[PDB]
Amino acid sequence: RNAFYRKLQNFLYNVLERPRGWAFIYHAYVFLLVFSCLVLSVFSTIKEYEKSSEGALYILEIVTIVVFGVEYFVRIWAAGCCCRYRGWRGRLKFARKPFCVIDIMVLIASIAVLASALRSLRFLQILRMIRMDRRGGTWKLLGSVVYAHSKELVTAWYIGFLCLILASFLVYLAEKGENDHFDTYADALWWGLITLTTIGYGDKYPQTWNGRLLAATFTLIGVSFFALPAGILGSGFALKVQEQHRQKHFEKRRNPAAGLIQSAWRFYATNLSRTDLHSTWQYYERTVKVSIRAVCVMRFLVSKRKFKESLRPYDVMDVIEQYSAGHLDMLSRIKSLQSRVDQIVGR
Amino acid sequence: RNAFYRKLQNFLYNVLERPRGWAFIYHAYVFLLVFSCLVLSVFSTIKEYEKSSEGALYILEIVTIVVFGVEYFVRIWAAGCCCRYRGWRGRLKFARKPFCVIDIMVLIASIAVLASALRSLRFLQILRMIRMDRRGGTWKLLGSVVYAHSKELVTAWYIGFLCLILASFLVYLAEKGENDHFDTYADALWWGLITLTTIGYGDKYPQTWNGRLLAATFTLIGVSFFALPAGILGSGFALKVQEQHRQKHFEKRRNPAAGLIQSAWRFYATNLSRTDLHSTWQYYERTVKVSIRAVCVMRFLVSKRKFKESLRPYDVMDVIEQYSAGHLDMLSRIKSLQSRVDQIVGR
Amino acid sequence: RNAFYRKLQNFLYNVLERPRGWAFIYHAYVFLLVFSCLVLSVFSTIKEYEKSSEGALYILEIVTIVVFGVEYFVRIWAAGCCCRYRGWRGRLKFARKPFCVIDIMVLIASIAVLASALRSLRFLQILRMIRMDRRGGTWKLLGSVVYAHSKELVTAWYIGFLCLILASFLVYLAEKGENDHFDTYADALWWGLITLTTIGYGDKYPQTWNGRLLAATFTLIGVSFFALPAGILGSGFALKVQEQHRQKHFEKRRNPAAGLIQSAWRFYATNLSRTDLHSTWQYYERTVKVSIRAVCVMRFLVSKRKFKESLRPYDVMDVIEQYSAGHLDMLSRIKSLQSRVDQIVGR
Amino acid sequence: RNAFYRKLQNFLYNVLERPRGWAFIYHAYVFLLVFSCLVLSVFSTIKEYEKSSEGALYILEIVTIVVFGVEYFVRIWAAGCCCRYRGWRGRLKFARKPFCVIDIMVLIASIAVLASALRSLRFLQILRMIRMDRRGGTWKLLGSVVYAHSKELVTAWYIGFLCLILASFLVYLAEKGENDHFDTYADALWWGLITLTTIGYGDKYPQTWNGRLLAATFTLIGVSFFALPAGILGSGFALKVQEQHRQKHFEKRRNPAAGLIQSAWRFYATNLSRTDLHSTWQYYERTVKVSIRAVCVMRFLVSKRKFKESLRPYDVMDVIEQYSAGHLDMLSRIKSLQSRVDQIVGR
Amino acid sequence: TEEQIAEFKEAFSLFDKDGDGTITTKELGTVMRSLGQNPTEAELQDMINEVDADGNGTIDFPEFLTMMARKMKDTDSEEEIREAFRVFDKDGNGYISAAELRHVMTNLGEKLTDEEVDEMIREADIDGDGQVNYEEFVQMMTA
Amino acid sequence: TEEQIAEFKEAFSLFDKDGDGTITTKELGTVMRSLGQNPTEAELQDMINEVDADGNGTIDFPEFLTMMARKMKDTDSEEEIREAFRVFDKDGNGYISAAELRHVMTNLGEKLTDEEVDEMIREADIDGDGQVNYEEFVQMMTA
Amino acid sequence: TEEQIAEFKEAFSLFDKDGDGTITTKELGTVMRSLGQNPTEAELQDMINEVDADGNGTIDFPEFLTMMARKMKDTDSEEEIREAFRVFDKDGNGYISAAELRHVMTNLGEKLTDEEVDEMIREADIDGDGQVNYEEFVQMMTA
Amino acid sequence: TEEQIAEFKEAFSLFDKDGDGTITTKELGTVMRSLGQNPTEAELQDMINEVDADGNGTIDFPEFLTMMARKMKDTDSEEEIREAFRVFDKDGNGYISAAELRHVMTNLGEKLTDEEVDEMIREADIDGDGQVNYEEFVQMMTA
C-alpha cells in the first residue's frame, strides 16, 4: 500500500506546511490552544485566580507539548513528499532549517520546565506565538506596504510630531501656572501625546481658557495627523489587494510555461543524465549527437528567457505594450500595402 | 377587476418583499417602530422610569404586533405575484421559508407574552432586530470583503497583538512597583488593550518616567496597528463598490440575453408541452418534428452557454479580451491581404 | 467709462458670487469674522468673561453687520453681470431668491437686536453659519457619497450595533452584581457605546474578570466596526476625487460645442427676431425662406441633441466605446476590402 | 590622485545632500542624535531628573555641535561636485542658500550658548528638528493632497462642526440644570469637541437621561464626521502613491531625451562658443556657416518642444491619446486604401 | 415510454448518415443545411462541446436521450432566463412592453416571426394586457 | 396668427413632394440636396428620431408647428449653450477674444462666412470691446 | 575531462563553417536549417543575446565549454520550472492530469511527439499512476 | 557689435529668396533640401510655430536677430537637458558609460558621427575617465 502511504504523507505535508483551504482550520485550532495557554498564564499572574488557573495550565501545557511534539514528528515524516527532504540526509537537512530548530528548542525547553520558571513559561508562550508565522509573511507584507508609502508615512508622522510639540508648548504656557496637571513641559508633552493620539486618559487636560482654546484649535489638526498613518496604510493594503487580484486574474503565462516545460524536457533528454535516453534522439534525427544537444540547449535557453520576460504581467503594462505592438504593426501594414499597390500599378 | 387585484398584489409584494426605491421608506418606518420598542425596553430597566416606559411599551408592543401580523398576512397573500407561490400549496411553501417561520414564531411568542418575561421581551426584540436582514446581505458582504483582505487583516491584528503584548510587558516592568494601577501583568494587558485601541478609560495609565517613555514609544505604533483593520476594511468596501459601479455600467450583454429569450421560446414551441403550438411549427416548415425539437434544444443550449460566457464582463477583462481579438484579427487580416496581393501578382 | 463700470461690476460679482481662485481669500476673511463673533459669544456665556467678551462683541457685531449689509448691496448691484438679473425687475427677482432673502432677514434681525435676545443672536450666528454654503454643495456631496456607499455603511452600522448590544448585555451580566457602574442595562449600553466608539470617558468600565475578558474579546471587533463608516466614506471621497480628476481631464467635447454655437448663431440669424439679419440670409442664398428657417432650427436642435448625448464622457466609457467602434469599423473595413479584391479578381 | 579626490567628493555630496538608498541610514543617525538631545532637554525640565539629564545633555550638545559643524564643512567642500557651486564664488553662493544659513546660525548660536538660555536651547532644538527637511517635501506633499481633496475636507469639517454645535447645544439644554459639568455653553462645547474627536477625557460627560440619549444619537454621526478627514487624506495619499508608481513605470521618454541631447550638442558645436570645434563642421559640410547655425538651432528648439510636449506621460493620457491617433490614422489609411483600389479599378 | 424511445431512436437514425453508431459533425452540418441554415465548423465544435461530455468527437444515442429528456424545470436554467429578461429590464421594476419585446427579438439574434412573438406575449401574460412580467413568465415556464 | 399658420402650411407643402399628408425622408434629402448639402442615411435617421415622437417614420404638420414655435426662451438651452461655451473656456473666467471666436466659428464644425461671424460677435458684445461674457451672450437673447 | 573537451571542440568545429575561431549568426542559421527548422534573424539575435556576454556579435569556444559545463544544478532555474508547472496547475494543489500533459506537450510551442511526452510523464511521475507531482518532478531532476 | 548685425543681415538675406522682407515656408524647405535634410510640412509648421509670436505665418528679421543672439543660459533649457539625461539614467546614481553614450548619440533621432560624440563626451567629462557627470555637463554648458 505504498500508494496510500505516499498519498497520506503528501496530504499531511500539505495540511501542516503551506495550507490552502480547510487545512487552516487545523492551524486555527493549534493557535487557539496556544492562545488559551497564554490567557491562562495571565490568569495565573493574579494571586486570587492562581490556584484554578495553574491547575488548568498544567493540563493545557501537557496537552500543547504533546500536540507540538507529535506535529513535529509527523511533519519531519511528511517532509519525504519533497524530493529534497528525502531519507536520513533530507529529513536531517529539513530539521536543520532554523524555524524547525526553534520549534524543537521550544519543545525541549517546555518539557524541561515541566520536568521561578513561570517567566520562562510566558517567554516560551510568546516565542511560540511568533512561531505561528514561519515565513515572516506578515512582517514582509507590512514592510513592503510601509516602504511603498514611506514618504507619505514620514510626512504624516513628522507634521504630527511638529503639531504635538507646538500644541504641547502652547498649552503648557497657558496652563503652567494654574493647573497642577501641567507642572513641567514633560507633563504637557505627555498630555499632547495622549490627546492627539485620541487616547485621552483624562489624567491631564487643560482647564484654563487659554489652554482650552489652544487645545481646541490644535486638536482638529493633530488628531487627523496622528490618524493619518493608519488610513494611509489601510488604503495601501486595500489597493495592493485589488492590484494582486487583477494580476492573478491576468497571469496569461500558459504558453511561455508550456514552451518552457517542453524545452526543459528536451534538454534533459538530449543531456547524458541517463543512458536509456534514445527516443528523443530518434525524434530529432527523424526531423532532419553533440550538435543536437547544443541546439536543444539553445532552444531551452530562448524558452527560459521568453518565460522570464513574460513573468511580469501587470495590470496596466499589458494593454500598453499590446497597443504599442498593435500600432507599430498597423503602420508597417499600411506601408507594406502602399508598396504592394505601387508594385501592382507598376505593371 | 382581477387586473387591479393582481397589480395591487404585485405592488404590495414589491414594497414588502425586495424593495427598490421609495419602498425602503416603509421598511425604515417599521425599523423605527422596532427600534423605539427596544429603546423603551432599555428605559424600563431603570427603576425611576419604569412606570412611564412600561406604559408606553405596552401600547407600542400592541401596535408592533398588530403591524407585524398584518404585514405577515399581506405578505403571504402577495406571494401570489410569484407563480412558484400560488394557491394553498404555494402559500404554505412560502410560509415554510425559515425567516417567515421565525417571523411567525416571534409574533406568537410576543402575543403569548402579552396574554419575568421582560427578559424574553427584549430577547424577542433582538431577534426581530436580526430579522430585518432576511438575506444575510450585510453578513455576506462583510464576509466577502474580510476574506478578500484576510491576509492584510491578519497581518494587522497579529502585529498589533505582538505590539500590545510587548508594550504591556515593558510598561508593567517599568510600573510594577511604583503604581498600583499595574499590580499584575493582567492589569498591564488591560491597560495596553485600552490604550492601543485608543479607548483610554484612564483607570490605568503609566506614572513613572520609564513607563511613560515606553508607553510613548509604543503608542505611535500600536494605535496605528489597531486602527489598521478599520482602514483596510473601509478602503476595501469603497473599492468594491467602485468596481461594482463600473461593472454594472459595463453590463453589455443584451444581445446574448435576447438570443437566449428567442431560443427559449423557440425550444418551448418545439417542446410538446402544449398541442396548440403550430405557428412556430409552420415557421420551421416554411424555413426548409423530433429532429426540429433536437436542433432547437441545441440552439437553446448554445445560447445558454454563450450567455454564461458573456455573463462576467468585468472592468479590466473586457478591454484585454477585446484587444486580443482585435490584434489577432489584425494579424489575420494582414496575412490574408498579403496572400491575396501575391495571388494578384501571380496573374 | 461704461466699459470700466461693467468690468469692475463683473469682477465684483465673480469675487462675491461663484469664486474661483484668490476670491476665496475674501470669503475666508468673512468666515473668520463671523467665526470670531461666534467664539466671542461662547466667551460671553461665561460669567467671568462677560464684560470683556461683550465689549468686543458689540464692536464685532457692528462690524459684521456693516460688512454684510455692504456686501448684500454690492452683490445686488453687481448681479447685472448676469443679464437675467438686470434693471429694477432683474435685481428684484434676484433678491427674491430664497438665500438672499435669508441674508436680508438675518441682517434686519441683527440690526433690530442692536436697536434676553442674546440667545436670538447666537441663533443668528448659527443661521449665518449655515449661510456660508449658499448651494448645499457640502450636503449634496456628502449625500451622494453616502448613497453610493449606503449598503456598505448600513452593513457597518448594523453589525456594529449588534456587536454593541451583545457586548453590553454580556458585560452587564458579568458586572451587574459587583460594579456600581453597571447598575442597569442602560448603564451597560452607555458603556458599550462610549467604548466601541473609542470615546472611553472612563465613567464606566468593567472591573471583574468576566467583564474585562468579554470586553477585551468584543472591543477588537466593535471598535473596528464603529470606525468602519469613517473609513468607507473617506475612501469613497478620495476615489470620487480621483475619478473626477480623470473625467475633467477627459472633457474632449470641443467639436460638439463648436457645432452647437455655429448652429445657434445660424438659427438666430435666420430667426425672425431681428429685421436687420441679412448676412446669413445672403450666405444661405449664395450656397444654393421658411424652409431654410426650419432646416437651420433643426440643425440647431440636432446639434443640441448631440451635445447632450456626448455631454458626459467618463473615464472608462470613452475608451471602451471608442474601441468597440474601432473594432466593428475594422471588421467592416476587412469585409469591404475582401469584397473589393474579389471584384478585382473577377476582372 | 584627483580622480579619487573627486570620486570621494561626489560620494560625500550624494550621501549628505540628496540621498537615494543607504545614505538615509546616516541621516537617520543624525536625526536620532538631535532627537535624543530633544528628549534629554525634556528630562531636564523635571526638577528630579535635572542633574543627570543636564549632565548627559552637555556631552550630547558638544557631540551634536561637533557633528553639525563637520557635516556643514564637508557638505560645503563636497559642493564642488556641482559646477555651479565650484570655487570661491560657487562655495559662497551655496552658503548663501537659506537653509545653509540657518544651519550655520544654529551652529553659532549653540556654540555661544555653550560658551535662562535653556529655553533658547530647546528653540534651537525644534529649529534643527525642522532643519532636515531642506525642501518642504513633507509640507509640499501634504499641501498638494489637501488641495486636491480640499472640497471633501471642507465638507467633512463643516458638517462635523455643525454637528458639534448642535449636539453641544442640545446636551447643554439637557444637562444645564443637574450636571455641574455643563455649567455654561462653553463647557458643553468643550465636551462636544472632546467627545466627537473621540478623545473623551471624561472630565465632562452627560449624566441625565435626555442628555445621554442625545449624546448617543449624535455621537455615531459626529465621530464619523470628525474621523472623515483622516480617512480622506490617507486614501488620497495611497491613491497618489499608486498613480505615481504607475507613471514612473510609464516614463517612456527616451526618444525625446536622446533627440534633445543630440540637437543640444549640435547647436553648441554650430555656436561660436569654442573655435576649436571642427569635427561637427566637417560632418555638416560632408552631408551637403551661419545658415547651418540657424537651422541647427531650430532643430534643437523643435527637439526641446517635443520633449516638453512628451514630458507629461500619465497613466491614462498616453493610452487614450495613442488610441485617438490610431483611430484617425486608420481613418486616413482606409480612405487612402479606398482611393488606391478605385485607381486600380480605373485601369 | 417505449414509443418515445423508438421515436428518439428514429431521430438518431435520421441524424445518422454513414451509420457508425454515433452522430458526427458533418451529419449535423448536413441536416442543418437541409433545414436552411448554413453551419460553421466552429459551430459544430460548439454543438459537440455542448452535448458531448466524454470528449470523443461524436454524439451517441444515450447522450441524446439524456439531453432531450430534461424539461424546462429540470434544465436548471431559471437564473439564466431570469437574468436574460433582467438585462432588458431598463427600469428594473419588473415589467416589459410587448412592442419592445417584438422590436428586440424579431430583429436581432435568433429572429422570430410575428406569429411566434405574439404567441409568446399571449402565453407569458395570462391577463393579456401587453405588459410582461419576466419572473411570472419564467416561473410558469421553467418552474 | 392665421398668416403665420398659412406660411407654415406652405412650408410643409414645399416640404411635401408626393403629397401623402406627411414628409418622408427622401423629400428632406431632396430639399437638402437642392440647398447644396448632401444628406446621409444616418442623418435622415437622426432627422426622423428627432422630429417624430409617435414612431411613424414621417414628419407631420403639427409636429413641425410645435418644433418651429419654440424660441430660445422656451428651448431650455440656457445651460446647454453655457456648457458649449465653457468647453472652449480654457481659463474658465468667462471671456473669449474675438479672434478665437472667428477661428472656432469659421474653422471647426458648421463653418460660416466672415460677415455672419462678425455679426455674431457684435451682437454678443453690446460694448463691442472684443470681450464676450457668455452669461449675457446666452441671457439677453437665449433666456 | 579531456575526452569531453575534445568532443566539444569537435562540436564547435562542426558548428564553425568559415573557420574564424567563433560561431557567427549565419552558421547558426545553416545548422538550424540542416536540422530541418527554418530560423529567423530575430531568432538569431535572440541566440546572440542569450549566449554572448561581451557584446562582440559571435559565440566563442570557451563560452560554449563553460555553458555546457553547467547542468540544471548550475542554472538556478528551480523557481522558474516550479512556476512553469504552476501556471498549468489550475487547482494549485500540485496535481496535473496525464492527458492534459500529453495535450499541452504536443500541441503548444516547441511541440514534441506523443511517445516523448509519455516518456516525460513516466520519468516525472515515479509511481506512474497518471498523477504527476510538479514539486516532485522539479526537485528530483532540476534541483 | 555691428559686425555681427551685418553678418545676421546677410544670413537673413541669403535665407530670403523672393525678397519680401520675411522668410516663407518654401524658402525654409528649399534651403533645408539644399542642406541635405528633406523637410516635412509638419516639420515646417512646427518650426513656424517656434518662430512667430504675433501670428502672421512668416519670419521677420528682428525675431531672427533677437533669438539667435542668446546664449545657452537665455532659454532656461537647464531642467530640460537634465531630464533628458535622467530618462537615460537607469540606475539614477548619476553615471553612465561612454560606450552607451556613443550608441545612443549616433543611433537615435538626429544621429551624429563617431568624432562628434567623442568630442561631446570629452567636453562633458573634464577628467576624461569615461564616467560623465550630467550635472557638471549641463552646468558648464547651460548655466
Author numbering:
A (entry chain A), B (entry chain G), C (entry chain D), D (entry chain B): 70 to 184, 195 to 367, 537 to 595
E (entry chain H), F (entry chain E), G (entry chain F), H (entry chain C): 6 to 148
Please share text taken word for word from the publication where this structure appeared.
Among the neuronal KCNQ channels, KCNQ2 and KCNQ3 form homo- and hetero-tetrameric channels and are responsible for the M-current, which contributes to the stability of the membrane potential. Each KCNQ2 subunit contains six transmembrane segments (S1–S6): S1–S4 form the voltage-sensing domain (VSD) and the S5–S6 constitute the pore domain (PD). The C-terminal domain (CTD), which contains three helices, namely HA, HB, and HC, interacts with the calcium-modulated protein calmodulin (CaM). Here we report cryo-electron microscopy (cryo-EM) structures of human KCNQ2-CaM in complex with three activators, namely the antiepileptic drug cannabidiol (CBD), the lipid phosphatidylinositol 4,5-bisphosphate (PIP2), and HN37 (pynegabine), an antiepileptic drug in the clinical trial, in an either closed or open conformation.
Because PIP2 can potentiate the activation of KCNQ channels by enhancing the E–M coupling, to capture an open-state KCNQ2, we solved the structure of the KCNQ2-CaM complex in the presence of 1 mM PIP2 (KCNQ2-CaMPIP2(-), where (-) indicates that PIP2 was added in the protein sample but not observed in the structure throughout this paper) at 2.7 Å resolution. Unfortunately, we were unable to capture the open-state KCNQ2 structure with the presence of PIP2 in the sample, nor PIP2 molecule was observed in the map, suggesting that PIP2 does not tightly bind to KCNQ2 in vitro under our structure determination conditions. The low affinity of PIP2 bound to KCNQ2 was reported in a previous electrophysiological study which showed that the half-maximal value (EC50) for diC8-PIP2 on KCNQ2 was ~205 µM47. The KCNQ2-CaMPIP2(-) structure is similar to the KCNQ2-CaMapo structure, with activated VSDs and a closed gate. In the VSD, the side chain of Arg210 (R5) points to the gating charge transfer center formed by Phe137, Glu140, and Asp172. The activation gate is closed by two layers of constriction formed by residues Ser314 and Leu318, with the shortest diagonal atom-to-atom distance of 4–6 Å at the activation gate. In the CTD, HA and HB helices are wrapped by CaM. As no inter-subunit interactions are observed in the CaM, the conformation of HA/HB/CaM is likely stabilized by interactions between the linker connecting the fifth and sixth helix of CaM (H5-H6 linker) and S0 and the S2–S3 linker from the VSD. However, in vitro the binding of PIP2 in the activated VSD is not that strong and PIP2 is easy to dissociate, which can explain why we were unable to capture the PIP2-bound open-state KCNQ2-CaM structure in the presence of PIP2 alone (KCNQ2-CaMPIP2(-)).
